[PDB]
Amino acid sequence: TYQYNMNFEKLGKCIIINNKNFDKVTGMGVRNGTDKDAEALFKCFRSLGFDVIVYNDCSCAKMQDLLKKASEEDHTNAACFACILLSHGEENVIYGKDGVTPIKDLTAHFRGDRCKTLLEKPKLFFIQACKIPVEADFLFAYSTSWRSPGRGSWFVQALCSILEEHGKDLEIMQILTRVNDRVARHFKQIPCVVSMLTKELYFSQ
Amino acid sequence: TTRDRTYQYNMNFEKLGKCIIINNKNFDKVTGMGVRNGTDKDAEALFKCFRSLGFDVIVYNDCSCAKMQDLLKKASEEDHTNAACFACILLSHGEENVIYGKDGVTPIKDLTAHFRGDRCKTLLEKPKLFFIQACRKIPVEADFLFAYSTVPSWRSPGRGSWFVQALCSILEEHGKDLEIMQILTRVNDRVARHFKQIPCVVSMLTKELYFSQ
Ligand SMILES: CC(=O)c1ccccc1Sc1ccccc1C(=O)O
């Protein structure tokens, strides 16, 4: 009644887009450490129960396509959908290998009006960057926005540690709030959660 | 499943805190903005909801941009040492990133910046709540929460706002026993299935926020 329904066959798909290397025309540096971030995210979100797939050094057209196809799959037997973006990024925009893609554009494939099979289900985007309305049920968690080369992103280690420890007994906003705290206190900038959720989200039934 | 309750915000203070309501109904003609019929009724419900919670509520009306900037700056300079939190509620016309005074637009970011950690030493580690109905070493930005009436928004000349009616209902039933994100989530659901619009919460809180004990 007050939780998103989790009585589904699978938890859902998790697309991790991992961008380490960038083109000539972009002029942005190798993000040393994401292979430690993405690998940790893979275990976290896998241990949660997501069908995780990692995609490396994506173009904008590829990210767009990758997400468009994802949105076009059938999610009837899924509880939710997760996308994780590791890249560079200016305000309101993310980076492929071959330029810039707006984050609005990636998410738009999943709005209530374009992906009937995810309607009334959580759509979760995690971004770290160096009768029903169409915007309901999205959540964004940004990190801002700094990456360590040997340990990873302050944000990723906290999110992963907390998820391994409390992924099954804490609501999504609790988990994220404790991530906000650990990033501010232990490692100076803070993450940001944007929530259009309409129920509590637990990763268990 | 369900939960009960050093992960919470400290509530052991004399006062819960200030709650500043800005009720902009009437705009200079040169702005081309129209009277916001219904907003008096919103500001009333809000004043009662927040007083009932424990807030020292103050209501300002038909404010200019300089007035809005000044009363916020001065509030940021008061001594909040004995308050658990702070709240501001903006009712006005709005556009992307901006809010309307009676005479113009002013960036929402400039209004909230007065309360950053480096500029308001006495609300440090304390939640700073901003509720915006705009019909279209510590990180300095920590412990802010923004609850906007819509994503980057209607109202009823006779019934009031959607958001406010919902927010205020949920605050009376559950304001003293639900966590702030639990409350705001339920408001989201009600503005969604009670009536073509969805509110939007931006949280940088570092703890859970309960308005009690
Ligand atoms: C970017 C953002 O989320 C934001 C939305 C509205 C108003 C100001 C902002 S910026 C911000 C965010 C958190 C804490 C303090 C501030 C500030 O510096 O006033």
Author numbering:
A (entry chain A): 57 to 186, 212 to 225, 231 to 273, 286 to 303
B (entry chain B): 50 to 54, 57 to 187, 212 to 227, 231 to 273, 286 to 303
Publication excerpt:
The caspase family of enzymes are responsible for controlling the final steps of inflammation and various cell death pathways. This highly regulated family of endoproteases employ a catalytic cysteine/histidine dyad to hydrolyze peptides with high specificity for aspartate at the P1 position. Initiator caspases (−8, −9) are activated in response to apoptotic stimuli to further activate executioner caspases (−3, −6, −7) by proteolytically cleaving the aspartate‐containing inter‐linker subunit. Once activated, they carry out the final steps of apoptosis by judiciously cleaving hundreds of substrates to dismantle the cell in a controlled fashion.
The current study employed a FBDD approach to identify a series of fragments capable of allosterically inhibiting caspase‐7 (C7). X‐ray crystallography confirmed that these compounds bind at the dimer interface of caspase‐7 more than 17 Å from the active site. The X‐ray crystal structure of caspase‐7 soaked with 1 was determined at a resolution of 2.8 Å. During soaking experiments with 1, electron density appeared in the known allosteric site at the dimer interface of C7 near K160. The carboxyl group in 1 forms an ionic interaction with the neighboring R167, and a hydrogen bond with T163. The binding of 1 occurred more than 5 Å away from C290, the residue utilized for the tethering of thiol‐containing fragments, further supporting the reversibility of the binding of these fragments. The appearance of density in the allosteric site occurred concurrently with the movement of the catalytic cysteine C186 into the P1 substrate‐binding pocket and the disappearance of the active‐site loop density for loops L1, L2, L3, L4, and L2′. Binding of fragment 1 appeared to move E216 towards Y229, displacing it and consequently the L2 loop. The partial occupancy of 0.71 for 1 results in alternate rotamer conformations of E216. Electron density was obtained for only one ligand in each dimer, near one monomer.
